[PDB]
């Protein structure tokens, strides 16, 4: 029955197997077969031999062949029940083929159907049969879950939503319905058999399924359903061996469900969590895999919950669970079932590290969020942190390969992040403990075992420890850890070794600063003993580099390192020879700047020479050619440095012993070129290295850059600027290759400055933009940024100055000046300030038209008023830097170490170069201004400095400058000697001079160097000046033509050189302008000779050629333009001799008894505006007096102002400089009177306007400042040819509340002119000097008598043949109202007779002296004033004087005589009209105003109160040369009440200082003016309170040299504030001047209180036997003084 | 009798 049906079913199975064109029919037969199977099932559902099952399996196979999973599912629908009722055992592989194979068929069916929901549900029932008989199944692997049955459930979830973001509620119910009813129900069983609990294999499957369902649900945002699912398992959780597993899973499911809540929540679950794991492991046979898989889920709850929601207690609670989890994983490792196949064993280790990865992350989280009060919590985590690292290192034991490499990689990270946290919150002690076990294992391990762990990970793990030890105070342990750091990286490249080496020097340097010497004693060699020699040598080289990087004193440390290195290197081997040569170069540096020859028996030069020989004996391979180039270049550079140091030291001792101008021959030898050859060779090697495209193969490129900087500074010092330019370009290349933008910006700034100094602004502009570009990659908080930005601003300001953009340039300069960063106390800032001061001077040398008034006030308000002041401050700052860097030995030879630390080396040569350049600028500017003495002082100082350094080029430059100064002083012999020294220096530097007659395109030393070319042209200029001064015309003119040719030719050579050097395509737009001041001076001198020779037509076109040249270059050559305009005006005036009427006549109302002039005034006004701001003395005086002559009485105020401003200009400049010095010390010690005097003597204190309106307003204010009762008369000589003496006298009478009165007196028209008077005075002095030597008494006395008579005749001539009628201009004005009324009446009547310019004031002045107006004076006045009808004017004048005679009396008053350089010599005070009047002399009118200011503020005590007779200091017979003077004066001087002083001894300079500063009277009855004990500088440094009664020879005289204003000691006394100065105008004899002194002292002192000194001065003038030869000598300088 | 000058 059933068997027959089964046989029919087997045939039906074959029939149903066919899926041909009748598959639907087969399906219909299959449906009938299913009913037939049901009929068979009624008899027997499944054969006891499972034949029905085999038939069903065949039917399932037939369905598989026919692709009918649905039919098979219906066919095998009751198989589970049949299998359940089957019981028994021995289910075969076919059982799987029908049950597990059904799932396999479903898997292919799942691969067939596109949909999943229905297919997954079918697979779930298929999964209920896939592993149904798994009670004895083999365990699954351990990348997966516990059992294969649960593994199938996870596999279905894989086909489900893979993203696992969220689970729909309906989907959750639907997904649960599948597994719960099909898979879960099958495993659980309706007949659960509670007596028999789940089998061991069955139990493992049950828990694994629950975890996978919970994991998928919770991950895909679904927790509520899993809560009920866990309870279902918990419902059956009476007791089990896997019980802990679901309790821990319950906690995990809890955690995600709780989510983010109160803090304790996380801890409370974690507290219970530790209990479950700990007690389970205590069990004798714990469910290892059950605990494992379950723990991984709990970890996920935390990892997904890692949202910074952590506290202190959470972390310790985590460590409890973490520790137990670690035991479980290592315990699973003990078990050897997975020990064989490490594949699963490796997975266990990854799980261990994931467990620890969680701990490290949680701690970093806690660390970042920590406050000061929280640091206590951070400390409690230390011991837990320590244990974590130990476990990790213990876990690695046995791993080899990438497993070793990777898993060491984590342990490095994990400790590093942990240590970083403690380092971050200021916990150094704890950080070291955490990294200690790792640090020691990494060092001790046999080098090479760990060859792949990233260097950075190891560097980071080690660095934290070295830094922590360093800052705690453990410098000793740090050095050992550094050795351990190097030990771990033993098989590593030298590049990684740099950081350990840097930390080594820092730790040792800090140790040394702490006072420890034992640490210093230890050197790397001893501690690293055991390493290979080559690696030890490399590390020692790196340590030497790190020592060279650090500042402060490191000489002996480097010496010890070099000694060790030299010992290591084997000399017998060529590679050892190379290493020895390098170490010898280092030793050469050390011995070059230290004294250790007591320990080496070798000098720096010997070491460097042996290094050079060894280097020359090295034949390199294919590579290493680059390193050899670098080494040889460095050796050559340091040979040069050491030779220069030895030369400087020898020069120091040369001066010390001597303590010149004879060493100039010693300077220039073959040794000079032999020495410079080293620098040339170094440059060649570095260019060869750093020009090729490939990046150089040098060990240290930073040293190459530093050496390039040192080479560039030395080249600028030796005055070779093009070579320095090349070196700076190479430095730019290196900085670009080194990615250092600070170096690039500094190098480009240096190139811009060099190009600006040469005079090429375009190439300069291009380099400024490269610098600006490089500056945009730097931290704007760095001082380097600030310095470079300020420098770029200065360079842009200078470029604006050059390209005539003065307004914006001034704004930029003011922005730089007002920046607070410029005043930072660093050496580089000091060097910046110097260039600031030089650019300030550059702006201050500009005419007022270029800038507004407001910006002029803003620029002057900074502190510097004249260019010379700024230049002097720059020089002073440079000297201060030299003192701060290299002591004072190079500057003075009356102990601080150089302290070379890299920057100091470059700065040293830089500062020397800048001192020399600033000296050149100062000398040129001061010599141009006419201040030759100060310029000579600076020139001698610079010459001494270059003598010590032995640089022939700078010596030649300063010797040419000195020759120019001596030509200015009219000292031809000394100038010629200086020029000959220049000639020898030039001729031996290149190996009628020979540098002339050179080709325009020449490559010699004197033609390839702009500095030498300039020196040659200046030499030619000074030689031409000498030739013209000696009368050799047409030779000096030839030399000036040579200069004119040479300058433009040399400019083109410099243009071509600059273009070829910088490799620009187009040439510089405009030729450089550096020889333009030379060409302009040549133009001036040639035009002045054209004035001397009006016939030479050649010179006539030169004035137009020069004017177009200077007009093309406004406003840079303005002084020469002013000179050329003055020459043009003189050419237009006509004949400068013959004393004709002259065009000026019409402008003057008195003659001795558009228009050309309009044009001359315009040209002169332009030139005056050109030089008004900073005038040269002689040129200014020429312009002022010529313009006064032209203006005449057309403008009285302009004429008076012009006459006033032409006297004592050099004294004005010197007073401005002195006042700045006073204000500078005032600022230093801590001023209103000082400020007002600066504003009175200033040249820029003007308003804006047209000439002469602001000048006249300033003059009117200064006239309003005049005191009452003082008459100022300016006697100046109008010169109509520069370098001559004029015969026209300009007389200006200045008084309070009276309009200025001027007059022109031509004296050439009459015999006894002003030149004759001066010539006679000089002849008288010469004859006196000749007569002084004679021994015959009678001849001596007779000659003296003749000289006295000549003096009397000269004095009479002064009054009668020079001043004539205008003598009354010097006499006081009458207070009686008669002359005013008479002048008022006569003015109109005189205007009707032809008085062109009626002045009532002049009439008043002349009518005041009516009594002394001789009839001849009246005739001259009337005939010269009214030339149309002279006789009527004479009648009117005679009537007026008749009405005024007798009825007028002169009054109390004072005459101040302002005289020019030529007229100051003459004794004007002894003229018969001026014998009864109080007369003194002042340098200028501004000095009278200054005296008024000082008196108002109470600074001159004697001009305010009087002279105390008991406050006198006398210096009598100091040198014991005069015995008569002592005998006459000793008793009188010593018996005087209160007088102190000296006799027979040179008073110590300290005694005369106190005499001038603390007393009221100072009498010097000795030789000269006392300049031997008290010079001008000493009196200038003090304020003179006392009246200087100097009775020596020529004490009050001023020495006129060449065309320079007179100089003398009296000027220094006046500038110091002397109330009155009495001195001798010429030389005197002892006894006669003794009588004069006795008479003066007796008369003044015996007079008593209130005795005017001047009255007794003129009364004492009648005492000597020689009345005029001795009495007329004394004169007075200052203001009148009385006894109190 | 000649008098010495008051100079150096
Ligand atoms: Zn040449």
Curated annotation (Swiss-Prot), chain A:
Name listed for the protein in its UniProt record: Separin
Gene that this polypeptide is encoded by: ESPL1
Catalytic activity: All bonds known to be hydrolyzed by this endopeptidase have arginine in P1 and an acidic residue in P4. P6 is often occupied by an acidic residue or by a hydroxy-amino-acid residue, the phosphorylation of which enhances cleavage
Cellular component per GO, a single term: centrosome
InterPro entries: Peptidase_C50 (IPR005314), SEPARIN_core_dom (IPR030397)
Control of this protein's activity: Regulated by at least two independent mechanisms. First, it is inactivated via its interaction with securin/PTTG1, which probably covers its active site. The association with PTTG1 is not only inhibitory, since PTTG1 is also required for activating it, the enzyme being inactive in cells in which PTTG1 is absent. PTTG1 degradation at anaphase, liberates it and triggers RAD21 cleavage. The complete phosphorylation during mitosis, is removed when cells undergo anaphase.
Pfam families: Peptidase_C50
GO molecular function, one term: catalytic activity
EC number: 3.4.22.49
Quaternary structure annotation from Swiss-Prot or TrEMBL: Interacts with PTTG1. Interacts with RAD21.
EC class: hydrolase
Curated annotation (Swiss-Prot), chain B:
Subcellular localization(s) per the UniProt record: Cytoplasm, Cytosol; Nucleus
Disulfide bonds: none
Superkingdom classification of source: Eukaryota
Primary role: May promote apoptosis.
Protein's recorded name: 64-kDa C-terminal product
Origin species: Homo sapiens
Lineage, highest ranks first: Eukaryota, Metazoa, Chordata, Craniata, Vertebrata
Recorded name of the encoding gene: RAD21
From-to range in the entire protein, with total length: 422 to 429 of 631
């Amino acid at each position: 029955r059933r068997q027959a049906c089964d046989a029919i079913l087997r045939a039906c199975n074959q029939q149903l197997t066919a899926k041909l064109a009748c598959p639907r029919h087969l399906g219909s037969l299959l449906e009938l077969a299913e009913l037939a199977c049901d009929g068979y099932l009624v008899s027997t559902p499944q054969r006891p031999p499972l034949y029905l099952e085999r038939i069903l399996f065949v039917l399932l196979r037939n369905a598989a062949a026919q692709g009918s999973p649905e039919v098979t599912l219906r066919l095998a629908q009751p198989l589970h029940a049949c299998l359940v009722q089957c019981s028994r055992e021995a289910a075969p592989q076919d059982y799987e083929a029908v049950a597990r194979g059904s799932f396999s068929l479903l898997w292919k069916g799942a691969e067939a159907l596109l949909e999943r929901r229905a297919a997954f549900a079918a697979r779930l029932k298929a999964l209920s049969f896939l592993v149904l008989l798994e009670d004895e199944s083999t365990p699954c692997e351990v990348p997966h879950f516990a059992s294969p049955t649960a593994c199938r459930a996870v596999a279905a979830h894989q086909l489900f939503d893979a993203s696992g973001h969220g689970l729909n509620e309906a989907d959750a119910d639907f997904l649960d319905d599948l597994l719960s009813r099909h898979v879960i129900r099958a495993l659980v069983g309706e007949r659960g058999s509670s007596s028999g609990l789940l089998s061991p294999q069955r139990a493992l499957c049950l828990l694994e399924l629950t975890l996978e369902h919970c994991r998928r649900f919770c991950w895909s945002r679904h927790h509520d359903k899993a809560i009920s699912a866990v309870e279902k398992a918990h419902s059956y959780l009476r007791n089990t061996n896997l019980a802990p597993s679901l309790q821990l899973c319950q906690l995990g499911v809890k955690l995600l469900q709780v989510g983010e809540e109160g803090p304790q929540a996380v801890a409370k679950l974690l507290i219970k969590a530790s209990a479950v794991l700990s007690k389970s492991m205590e069990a004798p046979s714990p469910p290892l895999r059950a605990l494992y898989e379950s723990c991984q889920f709990f970890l996920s709850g935390l990892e997904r919950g890692t949202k910074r929601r952590y506290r202190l207690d959470a972390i310790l609670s985590l460590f409890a669970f973490l520790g137990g989890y670690c035991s479980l994983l290592q315990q699973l490792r003990d078990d050897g079932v997975y020990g064989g196949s490490s594949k699963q064993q490796q997975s266990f280790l990854q799980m261990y590290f994931q467990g620890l990865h969680l701990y490290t992350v949680v701690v970093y989280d806690f660390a970042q969020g920590c406050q000061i009060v929280d640091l206590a919590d951070l400390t409690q985590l230390v011991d837990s942190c320590k244990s974590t690292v130990v476990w990790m290192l213990e876990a690695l034991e046995g791993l080899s390969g990438q497993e070793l490499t990777d898993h060491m990689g984590m342990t490095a990270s994990y400790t590093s992040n942990l240590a970083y946290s403690f380092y971050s919150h200021k916990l150094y002690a704890e950080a070291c403990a955490i990294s200690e076990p790792l640090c020691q294992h990494l060092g001790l391990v046999k080098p090479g075992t760990y060859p792949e762990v990233p260097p950075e990970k190891l560097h980071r793990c080690f660095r934290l420890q070295v830094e922590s030890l360093k800052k705690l105070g453990k410098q000793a342990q740090g050095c050992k850890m550094v050795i351990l750091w190097l030990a771990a990286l033993q098989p590593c490249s030298p590049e990684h070794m740099a950081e350990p080496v840097t930390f080594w020097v820092r730790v040792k340097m800090d140790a040394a600063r702490a006072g420890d010497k034992e640490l210093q004693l230890k050197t790397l060699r001893d501690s690293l003993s055991g390493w290979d020699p080559e690696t030890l040598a490399l590390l020692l080289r790196e340590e030497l580099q790190a020592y060279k990087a650090v500042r402060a004193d490191t000489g002996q440390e480097r010496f010890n390192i070099i000694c060790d290195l030299l010992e290591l290197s084997p000399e017998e081997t060529p590679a050892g020879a190379w290493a020895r040569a390098t170490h010898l170069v280092e030793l050469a540096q050390v011995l070059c700047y230290h004294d250790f020859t007591q320990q080496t028996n070798c000098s720096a030069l010997d070491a460097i020479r042996e290094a050079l020989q060894l280097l020359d004996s090295v034949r390199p391979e294919a590579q290493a050619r680059d390193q050899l180039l670098d080494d040889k270049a460095q050796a050559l550079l340091w040979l040069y440095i050491c030779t220069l140091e030895a030369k400087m030291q020898e020069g120091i001792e040369r001066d010390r012993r001597a303590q010149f101008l004879y060493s100039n021959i010693a300077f220039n030898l073959a040794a000079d070129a032999a020495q410079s050859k080293c620098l040339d060779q170094a440059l060649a090697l570095w260019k060869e290295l750093l020009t090729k495209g490939q990046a150089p193969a040098v060990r240290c490129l930073q040293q190459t850059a530093a050496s390039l900087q040192i080479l560039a500074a030395l080249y600028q010092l030796v005055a070779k600027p093009m070579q320095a330019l090349e070196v700076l370009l190479l430095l730019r290349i290196v900085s670009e290759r080194l990615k250092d933008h600070s170096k690039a910006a500094g190098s480009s700034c240096h190139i811009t400055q060099l190009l600006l100094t040469l005079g090429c602004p375009s190439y300069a502009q291009l380099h400024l933009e490269e610098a600006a570009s490089s500056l945009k990659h730097l931290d704007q908080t760095t001082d380097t940024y600030l310095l470079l930005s300020l420098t770029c601003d200065l360079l842009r300001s200078q470029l604006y100055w050059t390209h005539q953009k003065v307004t914006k340039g001034v704004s930029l300069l003011l922005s730089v000046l007002r920046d607070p960063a410029l005043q930072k106390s660093s050496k580089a800032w000091y060097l910046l300030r110097v260039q600031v001061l030089q650019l300030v001077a550059a702006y201050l040398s500009l005419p007022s038209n270029n800038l507004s008034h407001s910006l002029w006030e803003q620029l002057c308000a900074q502190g510097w008023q004249t260019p010379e002041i700024a230049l002097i401050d720059s020089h002073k700052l440079l000297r201060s830097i030299i003192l701060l860097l290299m002591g004072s030995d190079i500057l003075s030879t009356q102990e601080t170490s150089f302290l070379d630390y890299g920057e100091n080396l470059v700065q040293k040569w830089q500062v020397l170069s800048e001192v020399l350049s600033c000296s050149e600028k100062l000398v040129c500017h001061l010599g141009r201004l006419g201040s030759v003495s100060e310029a000579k002082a600076f020139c001698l100082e610079a010459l001494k400095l270059t003598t010590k350094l032995q640089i022939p080029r700078q010596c030649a430059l300063f010797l040419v400058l000195k020759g120019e100064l001596e030509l200015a002083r009219n000292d031809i012999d000394l100038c010629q000697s200086d020029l000959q020294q220049v000639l020898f220096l030039l001729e031996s530097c290149t190996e009628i001079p020979n540098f002339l007659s050179h080709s325009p395109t020449c490559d010699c030393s004197l033609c390839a160097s702009p500095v030498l070319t300039a020196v040659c042209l200046r030499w030619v200029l000074v030689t031409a000046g000498v030739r013209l001064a000696m009368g050799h015309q047409a030779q000096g003119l030839d030399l000036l033509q040579v200069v004119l040719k040479g300058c433009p030719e040399a400019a083109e050579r410099l243009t071509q050189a600059l273009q070829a050097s910088l490799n620009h395509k187009t040439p510089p737009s405009l030729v450089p302008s550096l020889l333009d001041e030379i060409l302009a001076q040549a133009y001036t001198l040639l035009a002045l000779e054209g004035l001397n020779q009006p016939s030479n037509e050649s010179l006539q076109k030169v004035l137009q050629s020069g004017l177009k040249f200077v007009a093309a270059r406004i406003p840079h050559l303005e002084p020469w333009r002013a000179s050329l305009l003055l020459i043009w005006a003189l050419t237009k005036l006509g004949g400068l001799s013959c004393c004709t009427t002259q065009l000026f006549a019409s402008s003057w109302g008195w003659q001795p008894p558009l228009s050309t002039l309009d044009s001359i005034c315009d040209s002169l006004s332009v030139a005056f505006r050109g030089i008004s701001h900073c005038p040269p003395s002689g040129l200014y005086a020429h312009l002022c007096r010529f313009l006064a002559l032209c203006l005449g009485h057309r403008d009285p105020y302009a004429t008076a102002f012009l006459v006033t401003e032409s006297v004592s200009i050099t004294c004005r400049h010197q007073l401005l400089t002195h006042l700045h010095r006073q204000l500078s010390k005032a600022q230093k010690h801590r001023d209103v009177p000082l400020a007002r005097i600066q504003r009175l003597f200033s040249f820029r204190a003007l308003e804006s306007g047209h000439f002469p309106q602001p000048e006249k307003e300033s003059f009117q204010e200064r006239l309003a400042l005049i005191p009452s009762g003082v008459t100022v008369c300016v006697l100046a000589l109008a010169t109509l040819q520069p370098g001559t003496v004029g015969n026209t006298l300009l007389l200006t009478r200045l008084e309070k509340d009276s309009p200025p009165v001027s007059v022109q007196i031509p004296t050439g028209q009459n015999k006894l002119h002003l030149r004759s008077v001066l010539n006679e005075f000089d002849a008288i002095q010469k004859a006196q000097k000749e007569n002084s030597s004679c021994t015959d008494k009678r001849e001596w006395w007779t000659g003296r008598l003749a000289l006295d008579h000549r003096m009397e005749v000269l004095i009479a001539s002064l009054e009668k043949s020079v001043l004539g009628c205008w003598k009354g201009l010097l006499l006081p004005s009458s207070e009686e109202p008669g002359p005013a009324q008479e002048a008022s009446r006569l003015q109109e009547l005189l205007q009707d007779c032809g008085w062109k310019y009626p002045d009532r004031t002049l009439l008043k002045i002349m009518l005041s002296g009516a009594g002394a107006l001789t009839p001849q004076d009246i005739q001259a006045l009337a005939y010269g004033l009214c030339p149309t009808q002279p006789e009527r004017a004479q009648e009117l004048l005679n009537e007026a004087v008749g009405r005024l005679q007798g009825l007028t009396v002169p009054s109390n008053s004072h005459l101040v005589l302002v005289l020019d350089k030529d007229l100051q010599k003459l004794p004007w005070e002894s003229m018969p009209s001026l014998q009864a009047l109080p007369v003194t002399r002042l340098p200028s009118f501004r000095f009278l105003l200054s005296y008024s200011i000082i008196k108002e503020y109470g600074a001159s005590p004697v001009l305010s109160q009087g002279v105390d007779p008991r406050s006198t200091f006398y210096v009598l017979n100091p040198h014991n040369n005069l015995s008569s003077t002592e005998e006459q004066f000793r008793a009188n001087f010593s018996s005087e009440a209160g007088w102190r002083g000296v006799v027979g001894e040179v008073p110590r300079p300290e005694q005369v200082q106190e005499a001038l500063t603390k007393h009221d009277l100072y009498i010097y009855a000795g030789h000269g003016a006392g300049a031997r004990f008290l010079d001008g500088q000493a009196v200038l440094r003090l304020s003179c309170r006392a009246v200087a009664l100097l009775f020596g020879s020529s004490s009050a005289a001023l020495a006129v040299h060449g065309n320079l204003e007179g100089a003398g000691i009296v000027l220094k006394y006046i500038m110091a504030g002397c109330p009155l100065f009495l001195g001798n105008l010429w030389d005197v004899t002892d006894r006669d001047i003794d009588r004069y002194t006795e008479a003066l002292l007796q008369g003044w002192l015996g007079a008593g209180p209130g005795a005017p000194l001047l009255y007794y001065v003129n009364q004492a003038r009648q005492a000597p036997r020689l009345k005029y030869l001795i009495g007329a000598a004394p004169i007075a300088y200052g203001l009148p003084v009385s006894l109190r | 009798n000649p008098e010495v000058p008051r100079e150096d």
